[PDB]
């Protein structure tokens, strides 16, 4: 009778409870208090209500989905995925998420506290899957939003180690969808071959989505995998912080990127990356411009630690027939990055910053400007010929480098013959320290190899801090590169023994608004006059020089060459020296040649 | 009998429980285990103990207060504000918090896990309110402390959208009070017209208070609102990190500031701001000096992302009759900030740094020094005439700028006629990159417009990275500004066509300890002597010049002007050139004029 | 009968429950739901299962250990240490942790949510203790791992204020051991005399361990304490963020360090330190190289706020007979640090960076290179003679300084006679601002006091921003220091009245590959020739000078000295000036002396 009610599922609803025997507290039943929390256990049962234990040969999907659906009906709450158990997912979800190869449909206000482990069963071997999907429709253009959905805890999402069946397939952990105020915190995503672990937003739709204190371990494992970017941030006001990214597979060194930032006001900070090809893409893709507009601005990549095999930060923008993408107002700072131990050319070209062409290779679609790269450290082993502070392979409308430390093969690089980027507002401040790891490795190479269509409104202030006499030059402009309204200086320190310092193969330094200084060795001859006496350069290629001054001591007693020189119409330098005793003098002097500076 | 006990509120205290049937575990009753957690449900009942459902026409205040009071009595714990429900607050609290228009009194060690939503009912329309108040007295000087009180979860505090009834009113979300080890984490504060969302500490009393991962959305909405600063940090060793601040109302663009730091060892980092007038105030107010002293030092504003309409960081200090405020040891770094799209002068003057006068307008009370602004990016649209790296409107005892990128109308600015600040130790390192967005907009304007009473021990190293021939000058000192013991240089790059580079309207560059260099165009005439021959400037205003050198090529064959010049007592420049053939020469040359450098 | 079962410990296992009366939910018993959580209460009982209340005269150790052991047996979970109670620990643990003076053995997957307080009883007075130990063996070489063990909450670990019994003793809060994915979050560690609060990893074994949002308050209190480092990070991919460290005891000012980073890819960020001797050690100890190798690389100390009494960041590496330690790829940025108010020499020598000798004092074992120090602020009161940007006391293979602000007594310092460090690749960029707080205090002192065995491949670009005529020199090299292949420049600004600017006591600036410029005052005499006329220096010590130029105005009408000078074999400077009227001229001029620059 009463016994029957008590042993029934309604029993706890008949056992009274008052918080700590407080007479002022609500008189409730045990069931009410138990109803304040909810776990997978409360839905992980057979049609008869008997609990099912999870494991290898149990598909937890439908039970988890029921839990999510039921809590969604009550306006939200948090479902615990209990510790001490692994909950295997063994089938595709149905309805709206079936188009996304979804396993589980996330729902608004329904949080998952994942304390235990979630593993994909062999069913998903060689198949595409997106484990959690916040889209409510197969077509995301027609999907509703996912709001206030947080996945967090000390738990694990394990992708079972299965390889991709085909390169064309997609795999994700959490596809939040058109996602507003959603986050993933504390979760370890491990043991997979996936396209992404997490995607935030959809073509700019979404806001305030974050990945914090998560771990991403060994999420590429096959040559089948076309591409990996662990977190793809595709909504504004969103980002990644204090995360850990690690790959061991050789394939990851060629295809894997830790983060992509694709919308405005997004960030990547305080994270550690190891074994990846790439740190981050920072890009406005025209195709993703619907939600938040055509401009990726306020892009922050800060205070990260990376060992990568390719490019740390890749800037881009591209266009569609109808929309043009723009990237501006980017800051890259405080990052300490190195190219991991590898053979030259054995992975994509090493670079701190890459200005990349779009996905179809186009290098004349880009609109990237107002980028500040500052207070970063970059290092590549001496052997890694393909390493650069910046690989500038596409049109650049501005990039500012200040107070960085770059210890790699090239400072500014682009391959000759390939793209011919149009370059505006490239600023390499003199405060960028050029490291010495690659000294004596630069035979035939130009430290700044300005392989561009044109350079305008740019500053290159070259400052060495050690000798490298192996390099062909500190900076070289091929005749094909136009240079105008630019400042190019090579500080004399450690350059005394250099044959070429700055090289302008088309004599571009003669430009009306080109401001240059660099050291050169010059032969001079004087008239025989006793007293104040002119010295002239034997060669006549200094028509562009506004002043020059000596960088050599004068070994002689009976005379001295001029300390300072100007030029003459015929291209000679001319200065006034002093013959204590008369006689024609002939000397070879190291000069700082200067034009308008 | 037994049935009666079981169905009574004491029933759960009669049902035994042993954790997982472990014989080594404590033999308890269900009630004991249920007593480990506590929710608003346990106090949200009528006088008869029957639960009351929350909602529009239910005032949850007294029940929440009872819960807090009861848990406070047991030494603390955490009350859950359940998800899936909105709990409306409908009346003022009583006792100590009545003076603060408090709704709820917070108590020490009593945490609130806000998972559901908390909404203010229409009762508070046009009224002042402080939702949570940690003061235990109407007079904060006589208030006890709030300790170890943490508010956190995925929940929402909603201010109901009500406007201020009068500008004189105050509104707050969490007024922690004299607050030690208190924090707010994860909470969304939205939909209001408030003075602040959160205040930490009281006039320097308090420690270790933080706002982390919170969102602040649309918390100004009326022209009635006198002022808004979302988080006001008024105790040391406290700060804001990884928060999101957003306003849409036009009124916010004129009055709203995201953060104020008012005490030592405080920080604002990793946050995103949009639609605000101001990023942060960093200030020592004499009036708030009781708790932590008279010095705001160790002030950090780092790695934030902002779109604002006024000033990013505002430095200040002021005084009372008895106390003088001091601000020092501040760091502003890594921030990427822009002035949002607006008409010139349509909001408070755009500035990355503002040295502001105190609240009564005084500009001669300030003691601000040892500030480092570094590795920040600042951008304002070309149209925004009122935009500056620094608006220096009050006395400055030091500010150091290094390796920043500033792309706005002015670098250093102050309005003429207005304040006449006394300036010491302003350091604008040459590594600050000056952007080109405002090139061709600067007609009648001085890039560095040194409208001060005096400048001493200062460095301005002007380096352009593109042409702007529209500007009247790169730097101008009016005669009213004293200049001494300072270094002022204008790099020649992109300046060749400029009429004025550095302008000293009172000839201040002649000062004994003024160190300057800038380009000037100078007319010279030579004697007729064949051979080494002097050239002299026709004008006699170079009495201050220690050396000059050519920045022009020499078009002539038969002679060359001097490469380098010194001066003469009468103010002429004089150099020694060379007449291959005799004849009086007359030339106009671009020179780098130098004084003691 | 039924009553008997219900009042028994099995009773809750007989009371049915179905989540919110949902017919689709699992039919369970109350006990099942209660079994989803676990607290110290469930094991804090006598042999008869009756609960024991915690407190002063109750030793909670065995009960907590039983709880941990039991949850470990079920594959993990989280034990709550309830709020509102203090749980005293009163004895040593047993077995594997007995060797580590362990109190509690941590176990994998078993998290502790510490909401209440944990206090050490008087038993531990004058004794060594490690409160939580994740080693499972007395010998860590033979210990298994601790994995997925997280300690977190709003609770407190209190060390009872007991002093060390002897300097030889060790004391720790959490010794995670060979620790993989373990963390401590939110916990206050207070009131002790300990060696550390937390240690992560063991000699490089471990990964992904973190200390976040923790507080460390007054953890040194006796002159007995040999040494303190609050968090010791001894496994890679691990770090400290957003923590608070505070000491009040005078002893802490001499022995206490906030953090040590001893393995690769480790970080210390966003933290506030007060009252400590030292901010961080960043070091590769040969002895700790077993787990993660011989290289500490990717070391990040960023965005911290410190008031310390000694050295902010101490770099080191040392060796064993068999292993050599290496430190490279370090970044120190964004930190705002000051030496607290103290008497000169009353604590270890104040320094932003210290290149320290190893523990046995050796200064010739170090291999430290590719360090970048950038965008930091450092300040020491004017009185603190012992304050330096860098104390360089041991061999340095590279350190790069850019865009810092240093306001202390020395920029570069080492005590004479003591160590004679060999120095390579020291780069002090011109963008480092030198503050004025110590102006007029530097009598007998060299701002850069290059007390080394040798300097090579180094850059010192000295830029003052105010006068200090008290200093003996801006930079001085004793004869014992070799200098080669280096650049040393002193900017002329604020140096006009200085007797010595750069001093080379062994004439090292004459080196073939030494590139220098600095101001000097020079006496010149001319020949009597009317017209172009040479001026020569009276002194003959400029054999090394490649060019010089005037930094003085010419007071005379009838002549002018040369604007620019070269030299002659005998060591004289020589230039060509102009005698309007003939006569031997004699002048004293301030020159910028230049060698190869
Ligand atoms: Na071209
Ligand atoms: Na004045
Ligand atoms: Na030596």
mmCIF file of N, CA, C and O in Angstrom, chain A residues 84-85, chain B residues 17-26, chain C residues 35-40 42-43 62-79 105-112:
data_model
loop_
_atom_site.group_PDB
_atom_site.id
_atom_site.type_symbol
_atom_site.label_atom_id
_atom_site.label_comp_id
_atom_site.label_asym_id
_atom_site.label_seq_id
_atom_site.Cartn_x
_atom_site.Cartn_y
_atom_site.Cartn_z
ATOM 1 N N UNK A 84 34.094 8.064 -14.185
ATOM 2 C CA UNK A 84 34.242 6.654 -13.834
ATOM 3 C C UNK A 84 33.639 5.732 -14.866
ATOM 4 O O UNK A 84 33.658 4.516 -14.699
ATOM 5 N N UNK A 85 33.112 6.317 -15.943
ATOM 6 C CA UNK A 85 32.466 5.564 -17.000
ATOM 7 C C UNK A 85 32.859 6.149 -18.333
ATOM 8 O O UNK A 85 33.080 7.353 -18.440
ATOM 9 N N UNK B 17 21.114 5.685 4.276
ATOM 10 C CA UNK B 17 21.905 5.726 3.057
ATOM 11 C C UNK B 17 23.334 5.430 3.455
ATOM 12 O O UNK B 17 23.813 5.941 4.479
ATOM 13 N N UNK B 18 24.000 4.597 2.656
ATOM 14 C CA UNK B 18 25.438 4.384 2.764
ATOM 15 C C UNK B 18 26.046 4.423 1.364
ATOM 16 O O UNK B 18 25.668 3.621 0.502
ATOM 17 N N UNK B 19 26.970 5.354 1.136
ATOM 18 C CA UNK B 19 27.531 5.603 -0.192
ATOM 19 C C UNK B 19 27.902 4.325 -0.907
ATOM 20 O O UNK B 19 28.766 3.580 -0.452
ATOM 21 N N UNK B 20 27.219 4.083 -2.020
ATOM 22 C CA UNK B 20 27.456 2.924 -2.893
ATOM 23 C C UNK B 20 27.527 1.594 -2.150
ATOM 24 O O UNK B 20 28.313 0.713 -2.511
ATOM 25 N N UNK B 21 26.707 1.453 -1.113
ATOM 26 C CA UNK B 21 26.677 0.237 -0.298
ATOM 27 C C UNK B 21 28.055 -0.121 0.264
ATOM 28 O O UNK B 21 28.313 -1.277 0.576
ATOM 29 N N UNK B 22 28.941 0.863 0.387
ATOM 30 C CA UNK B 22 30.258 0.622 0.935
ATOM 31 C C UNK B 22 30.119 0.478 2.436
ATOM 32 O O UNK B 22 29.658 1.386 3.097
ATOM 33 N N UNK B 23 30.537 -0.656 2.982
ATOM 34 C CA UNK B 23 30.397 -0.895 4.414
ATOM 35 C C UNK B 23 31.334 -0.005 5.228
ATOM 36 O O UNK B 23 31.097 0.232 6.403
ATOM 37 N N UNK B 24 32.398 0.486 4.602
ATOM 38 C CA UNK B 24 33.311 1.421 5.251
ATOM 39 C C UNK B 24 32.839 2.865 5.238
ATOM 40 O O UNK B 24 33.462 3.727 5.846
ATOM 41 N N UNK B 25 31.745 3.143 4.539
ATOM 42 C CA UNK B 25 31.220 4.500 4.461
ATOM 43 C C UNK B 25 30.286 4.813 5.604
ATOM 44 O O UNK B 25 29.734 3.916 6.238
ATOM 45 N N UNK B 26 30.107 6.105 5.848
ATOM 46 C CA UNK B 26 29.278 6.584 6.928
ATOM 47 C C UNK B 26 27.835 6.150 6.708
ATOM 48 O O UNK B 26 27.334 6.187 5.590
ATOM 49 N N UNK C 35 24.417 8.492 -4.917
ATOM 50 C CA UNK C 35 25.727 7.939 -5.281
ATOM 51 C C UNK C 35 26.430 8.687 -6.430
ATOM 52 O O UNK C 35 27.612 8.457 -6.662
ATOM 53 N N UNK C 36 25.728 9.574 -7.140
ATOM 54 C CA UNK C 36 26.375 10.417 -8.170
ATOM 55 C C UNK C 36 27.341 11.450 -7.614
ATOM 56 O O UNK C 36 28.242 11.879 -8.316
ATOM 57 N N UNK C 37 27.148 11.860 -6.365
ATOM 58 C CA UNK C 37 28.106 12.729 -5.700
ATOM 59 C C UNK C 37 28.686 12.053 -4.454
ATOM 60 O O UNK C 37 28.140 11.052 -3.949
ATOM 61 N N UNK C 38 29.800 12.596 -3.971
ATOM 62 C CA UNK C 38 30.532 12.010 -2.851
ATOM 63 C C UNK C 38 31.293 13.111 -2.103
ATOM 64 O O UNK C 38 31.899 14.004 -2.713
ATOM 65 N N UNK C 39 31.252 13.050 -0.778
ATOM 66 C CA UNK C 39 31.898 14.051 0.059
ATOM 67 C C UNK C 39 32.696 13.378 1.141
ATOM 68 O O UNK C 39 32.528 12.190 1.423
ATOM 69 N N UNK C 40 33.540 14.159 1.784
ATOM 70 C CA UNK C 40 34.282 13.681 2.927
ATOM 71 C C UNK C 40 33.330 13.088 3.980
ATOM 72 O O UNK C 40 33.702 12.149 4.681
ATOM 73 N N UNK C 42 30.844 11.123 3.642
ATOM 74 C CA UNK C 42 30.615 9.717 3.360
ATOM 75 C C UNK C 42 31.716 8.774 3.865
ATOM 76 O O UNK C 42 31.538 7.564 3.819
ATOM 77 N N UNK C 43 32.853 9.304 4.307
ATOM 78 C CA UNK C 43 33.928 8.464 4.860
ATOM 79 C C UNK C 43 34.431 8.927 6.225
ATOM 80 O O UNK C 43 35.318 8.305 6.796
ATOM 81 N N UNK C 62 42.756 9.966 7.769
ATOM 82 C CA UNK C 62 42.423 8.620 7.336
ATOM 83 C C UNK C 62 41.101 8.577 6.570
ATOM 84 O O UNK C 62 40.916 7.733 5.677
ATOM 85 N N UNK C 63 40.187 9.484 6.911
ATOM 86 C CA UNK C 63 38.861 9.462 6.304
ATOM 87 C C UNK C 63 38.946 9.991 4.891
ATOM 88 O O UNK C 63 38.387 9.414 3.966
ATOM 89 N N UNK C 64 39.693 11.079 4.735
ATOM 90 C CA UNK C 64 39.940 11.664 3.429
ATOM 91 C C UNK C 64 40.667 10.653 2.545
ATOM 92 O O UNK C 64 40.330 10.495 1.376
ATOM 93 N N UNK C 65 41.656 9.964 3.114
ATOM 94 C CA UNK C 65 42.409 8.964 2.366
ATOM 95 C C UNK C 65 41.509 7.816 1.913
ATOM 96 O O UNK C 65 41.576 7.389 0.751
ATOM 97 N N UNK C 66 40.658 7.330 2.819
ATOM 98 C CA UNK C 66 39.683 6.300 2.466
ATOM 99 C C UNK C 66 38.780 6.749 1.312
ATOM 100 O O UNK C 66 38.550 5.994 0.363
ATOM 101 N N UNK C 67 38.282 7.979 1.387
ATOM 102 C CA UNK C 67 37.451 8.520 0.313
ATOM 103 C C UNK C 67 38.194 8.500 -1.029
ATOM 104 O O UNK C 67 37.672 8.016 -2.040
ATOM 105 N N UNK C 68 39.414 9.027 -1.029
ATOM 106 C CA UNK C 68 40.238 9.050 -2.227
ATOM 107 C C UNK C 68 40.487 7.623 -2.739
ATOM 108 O O UNK C 68 40.346 7.349 -3.930
ATOM 109 N N UNK C 69 40.852 6.720 -1.838
ATOM 110 C CA UNK C 69 41.102 5.336 -2.217
ATOM 111 C C UNK C 69 39.853 4.692 -2.830
ATOM 112 O O UNK C 69 39.943 3.986 -3.839
ATOM 113 N N UNK C 70 38.691 4.951 -2.233
ATOM 114 C CA UNK C 70 37.456 4.314 -2.683
ATOM 115 C C UNK C 70 37.002 4.851 -4.041
ATOM 116 O O UNK C 70 36.513 4.100 -4.887
ATOM 117 N N UNK C 71 37.162 6.144 -4.264
ATOM 118 C CA UNK C 71 36.740 6.726 -5.539
ATOM 119 C C UNK C 71 37.723 6.307 -6.639
ATOM 120 O O UNK C 71 37.323 6.068 -7.788
ATOM 121 N N UNK C 72 38.999 6.189 -6.273
ATOM 122 C CA UNK C 72 40.024 5.668 -7.178
ATOM 123 C C UNK C 72 39.676 4.273 -7.698
ATOM 124 O O UNK C 72 39.963 3.953 -8.853
ATOM 125 N N UNK C 73 39.075 3.455 -6.832
ATOM 126 C CA UNK C 73 38.660 2.097 -7.168
ATOM 127 C C UNK C 73 37.537 2.047 -8.206
ATOM 128 O O UNK C 73 37.446 1.068 -8.960
ATOM 129 N N UNK C 74 36.687 3.083 -8.237
ATOM 130 C CA UNK C 74 35.584 3.183 -9.212
ATOM 131 C C UNK C 74 35.938 3.943 -10.491
ATOM 132 O O UNK C 74 35.067 4.259 -11.291
ATOM 133 N N UNK C 75 37.217 4.224 -10.692
ATOM 134 C CA UNK C 75 37.675 4.859 -11.922
ATOM 135 C C UNK C 75 37.736 6.366 -11.836
ATOM 136 O O UNK C 75 37.991 7.025 -12.839
ATOM 137 N N UNK C 76 37.519 6.912 -10.639
ATOM 138 C CA UNK C 76 37.626 8.342 -10.423
ATOM 139 C C UNK C 76 36.313 9.035 -10.113
ATOM 140 O O UNK C 76 35.260 8.399 -9.999
ATOM 141 N N UNK C 77 36.411 10.352 -9.960
ATOM 142 C CA UNK C 77 35.298 11.224 -9.588
ATOM 143 C C UNK C 77 35.819 12.362 -8.726
ATOM 144 O O UNK C 77 37.026 12.521 -8.557
ATOM 145 N N UNK C 78 34.908 13.136 -8.155
ATOM 146 C CA UNK C 78 35.273 14.310 -7.387
ATOM 147 C C UNK C 78 34.736 14.243 -5.957
ATOM 148 O O UNK C 78 33.537 14.126 -5.759
ATOM 149 N N UNK C 79 35.626 14.320 -4.973
ATOM 150 C CA UNK C 79 35.227 14.388 -3.574
ATOM 151 C C UNK C 79 35.150 15.830 -3.102
ATOM 152 O O UNK C 79 36.098 16.609 -3.270
ATOM 153 N N UNK C 105 47.668 10.905 0.145
ATOM 154 C CA UNK C 105 48.035 10.413 -1.184
ATOM 155 C C UNK C 105 46.945 10.761 -2.175
ATOM 156 O O UNK C 105 45.806 10.346 -2.006
ATOM 157 N N UNK C 106 47.300 11.543 -3.190
ATOM 158 C CA UNK C 106 46.416 11.794 -4.321
ATOM 159 C C UNK C 106 46.442 10.584 -5.234
ATOM 160 O O UNK C 106 47.416 9.826 -5.266
ATOM 161 N N UNK C 107 45.354 10.398 -5.970
ATOM 162 C CA UNK C 107 45.221 9.272 -6.875
ATOM 163 C C UNK C 107 44.591 9.746 -8.163
ATOM 164 O O UNK C 107 43.840 10.716 -8.175
ATOM 165 N N UNK C 108 44.889 9.041 -9.244
ATOM 166 C CA UNK C 108 44.500 9.472 -10.577
ATOM 167 C C UNK C 108 42.987 9.571 -10.747
ATOM 168 O O UNK C 108 42.247 8.825 -10.132
ATOM 169 N N UNK C 109 42.534 10.503 -11.577
ATOM 170 C CA UNK C 109 41.096 10.743 -11.820
ATOM 171 C C UNK C 109 40.287 11.144 -10.596
ATOM 172 O O UNK C 109 39.082 11.358 -10.710
ATOM 173 N N UNK C 110 40.930 11.237 -9.433
ATOM 174 C CA UNK C 110 40.227 11.601 -8.231
ATOM 175 C C UNK C 110 40.512 13.050 -7.946
ATOM 176 O O UNK C 110 41.613 13.425 -7.548
ATOM 177 N N UNK C 111 39.490 13.856 -8.163
ATOM 178 C CA UNK C 111 39.577 15.270 -7.973
ATOM 179 C C UNK C 111 39.117 15.591 -6.577
ATOM 180 O O UNK C 111 38.309 14.861 -6.005
ATOM 181 N N UNK C 112 39.651 16.675 -6.022
ATOM 182 C CA UNK C 112 39.142 17.222 -4.782
ATOM 183 C C UNK C 112 38.583 18.600 -5.024
ATOM 184 O O UNK C 112 39.320 19.513 -5.422
#
